[model samples]
Target: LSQDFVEALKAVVGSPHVSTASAVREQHGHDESMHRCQPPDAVVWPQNVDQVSRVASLCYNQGVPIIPFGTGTGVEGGVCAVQGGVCINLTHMDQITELNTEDFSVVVEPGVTRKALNTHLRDSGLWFPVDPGADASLCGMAATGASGTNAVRYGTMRDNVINLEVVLPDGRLLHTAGRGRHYRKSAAGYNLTGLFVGSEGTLGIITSTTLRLHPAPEATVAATCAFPSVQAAVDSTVQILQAAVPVARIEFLDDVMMDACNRHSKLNCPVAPTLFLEFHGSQQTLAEQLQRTEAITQDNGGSHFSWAAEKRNELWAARHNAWYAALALSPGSKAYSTDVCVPISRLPEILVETKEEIKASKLTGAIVGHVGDGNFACILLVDPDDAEEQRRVKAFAENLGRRALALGGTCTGEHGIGLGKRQLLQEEVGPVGVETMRQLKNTLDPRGLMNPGKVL
Candidate 1:
């Protein structure tokens, strides 16, 4: 934070795009996580890839850490300015560079949010389905390797992204799959695109991205079924998948989450372990899928089979807001939204054990997840001032991660290793793997200024 550095950044993106105000810096500091705010010295909104490169060059020359900010919707403190240097806000560069409907792909600037892209593609009969609930930036989603209910069907960001335009730590441009290339498959050098997909800005700032798209389903159906217990609900999910049903979305909500959503979202749904499902296909195909799914639920002792006919969108709207609904369960309580993904065969055992652990700990926690992929998250709410409660919450989250690992799963299903999961990441990847990551980091960011204090 030298005055010279501020003047240089202002010169690159212009003075209007650079901000030194306390309020603006504070806003760019923290994300949705429970981490303390560590504001950057300045915030700069680079309107294009060229400006982004210039800003990175200035920050590099000044030896200042750079934290990339999109919509700040990340739950793992991915946007936090831990070292407090420069925060490059990319919302000003919103642009759809290319949309190839024939090839089912599109290119966008870093500032393009998922919803905005979908809206732009509304008339194209194609949609980008890698949703993460919030209207997160498309490039941010790619950077974080994000997924949502649609992941089970269309795959995560890793599977959908075709190529990336990355501005390296030293301001050099690198086209991952090669410049001006957006092919469906490539065997050229390394998987550079993947290496940066989940890099979380540790490697570089993604300036533009080429994404794969899918044809909009002709027919869609949303349904819900209540189960007597967690085991029953989970068993039904397994059977549905085993039956070879191509379910577009299969979400799980525990009784606690159902109650929370019921109260928060003003719904009269049954407060029981539930499965919120959606199917995509032709009307004929949907009917057959629904029948098969209904049979599976009934066989698993599920009851209250209901279809979200009029409230189709509302059904998913509530599911997406489960985080806030869980928070509302205990007002003024901070929460940790931790996720884990285990093998489908191990999901039942781990989820049952986790529920017992939550009950024994007596913490305000609610469970929700995209169970089709055998991934789930626990929204654990705790009073920030209560040290005892904080310890229990930390211990509980750690236990959950370890449990997932023991069951042959990951510590984080989508949320990357931000401030909290560094230790878990080390344990998950082992010392050698961590060393390899360090080697990569040192190679690209030799000065260690890009999004410092995150991931590796």
Candidate 2:
């Protein structure tokens, strides 16, 4: 925050790349969540690994917090500079440094967004499948443990992210996956890659990432069905799982969410509780799978089973835009996007119980999720000016977390422990676990300056 501190940063990343302009500082603030904007003291764009290493060293020596910024697409307040230090925007360093088609691996800088990587891989017959809806930076996605519609089958960022090239708070560069990306799996020692994959920048700044890619399916298809009730829809989903259907994506929406999507996305589908599903395989194999899925839906009182590419894209796009759609329904509301994942058996009751509870509170909301993985995310709308409503939202989130835990599920399925979920994290991990995480953080960042006011 001092002139000398700013000057030291300017020397590392160059004066032109360092700025304290209110516009620049404010832009690096909070993310897509309702977290209030808390801008950094200054912002710097590091174009290479050396520059990033130097900037981290300077900030560490100055005892200043270092917040890593990517596309700012995080729903939690993971990148917010609440401690007011240097915001290192890594967008300039985006470059695909390596692409080995035979090995099914790719090396990308932190600035490379998800969509861009897929576009580059179009002709390679392989695709990166951890789609968090947004075109988030790969490193950002790794740092936050993001997973979306594709996660049910392909797994999360934690699974596909093979290696991370990182800069520690002490200014030293470290490789998480030993022998670089070539070493795929090992139990040679403690898993450093697993440790930082979801650290959310509390431990270090990720500069480059090595991601594992899956082959593109020959034939992909999507379908949807309306159910008699939420229970019926969830039951069918569980049956689909028990049947080993191999569905790529199976999303659920209660009547309220269907209504929200209809009003916002201009689609005229049944307003009943619904499940939208997708599959990828050979043409003949997909046809067989689709028929089996349809049969299950029909047996469970699900109506309107159909498969069309048009409806598939429209349906998922609508699902992904649930936040904006919910906001459109309430012009003066800020969303507290909360998520909880339960065992498949627990999802039906949890979904049913929460909707009634939410309705009793009289807050505008919508529920949508990658239910195939037992993950459900709900948008709780609150008017910023209404303190009472904010309190209600907080209570609702706490109850949601507790209920998920009671059901042997996680408080957060993908989004890491950011600002709002610390106590819930303690509840999930217990005091000993939280202390272990604190020790890990302290070992890497003894000054406690890396992305301060986040996680533990």
Candidate 3:
């Protein structure tokens, strides 16, 4: 960091709030992903949008990269300051600005975690249903366009987010999706909400967001149905969708993943390709949905249907921790999890082909997905110290991404492109789309100070 830049930051946010400590810089440089780490030169804690704007303006004037940090749970290294500049940590800005239950929405600072928001809304009969399994900050989730198990029914970040308060690279604050005064379907301007939802911080810094919420389900039931094979499990998911079963969450775990779940959760579940399902509705409606799902599973050669709430919770908890279980399956190994989304009708073929490719490769991996939304992830456990293993894992990931593109699916479903999926971006979206994205980045951030070297 330049001396002038440090002094300027110190003036904007007191000296105590700015730090050049090696520990702080190093901690803010990496995330949960498998990307290489690059520490920032300095870290600054910004408490409000004014501070954020001031820091961004100073960084712009100094031509220093400014990366936004929120919980650092991003799987794509989006928060890492590879250029070694200022890292604006938003932890201190964590606060729920407002909760309007009548409108079924809540306004919150970017640093508010999903767990914290849910805890505050526990008694309000309303909940933010996007569960990324990482307890990620709402701002981080919105920036990365994160979605999880509940996305199958409630929808992803793109569907839930209504408005945003963004700080552009030029120090100006702009509100997208209106000022949270009225709620309507669509309007007469360019969709800024869509533009910034998945911008990955290259466009601007997301300080606060207003998210739409859904009412808590009156009754919820979860079940685990074991299938003869992964192919059969995927087919059952398709049949369930065709049968119009009201599923809140429908997840698939291959045999290897099932074993990992058993080990991680300390439960002796049957080692087979399984489907963990959830139904949210009235008691009678849930029962009807379960019956329909059961018939579909049976047609696809599934068995061992267990619907007890206690057993269901155990299964779903293990499912949510599937990545951890995959890592634990290979002790002392590093895991790289990648996600892709395909059409519902094509899921069975995609999973089968992917399984065949995995079997042919000399690597260790397991397959699991939120089948209801046609999104799935594979966990590859590799020896981090072994160059050969790393190369194999990279090749495997690239091959899977290519396959997804060939099948008319996206390279990423939930996890946004940070540093890991940059190459795949061109492959999935093509040269024209990639160039348009670059143009937008240049337009929004002329100096390229916001999250440099990310999602390009």
Model 1 regions lying over 4 Å from their true place: none
Cα deviation at 240, candidate 3, in Å, is: 0.8
For candidate 1, the TM-score is 0.98
Model 2 lDDT per residue over 1-456, tens place: 899888888887888999999998988898888888899999999979899999999999888889999899887798888889899999899899679888989999987888899899988899999888777899999899889898889999988888889999878999887546555687877889989998999899999999998899898887778988888898899889889989999988888888888899997878888888889999888988887888888899988575556777797888777777877778877788778988887888888888788778767668888889888888888888899888888888888889999889889988877898888888898999999999999999999999988888
Identify the runs in model 3 with alpha carbons over 4 angstroms from their true place: 309-313
Q: Tens digits of per-residue lDDT for model 1 on 136-215?
A: 88899888989999999999999999999999999999999999788878788788999999999999999999999999
TM for candidate 3 is 0.97
Model 2 weakest 10-residue run by lDDT: 177-186
**Which wins on TM-score, candidate 1 or candidate 2?**
1
- TM-score, per-candidate, Cα-based: 0.98, 0.97, 0.97
Residue 51 in candidate 3, Cα distance off native in Å: 0.4
Q: What is the C-alpha local distance difference test score of candidate 3?
A: 0.86
Pick the lDDT winner: 1
Looking at model 2, residue 448 earns an lDDT score of 96
Q: Over the stretch 35-119, how does candidate 3's per-residue lDDT look in tens digits?
A: 7678999999987889999999989888889898889988778888888888989878988976889989888897798889989
Q: In candidate 3, how many Å is residue 243 off?
A: 1.8
Q: What's each prediction's clash count?
A: 0, 0, 0
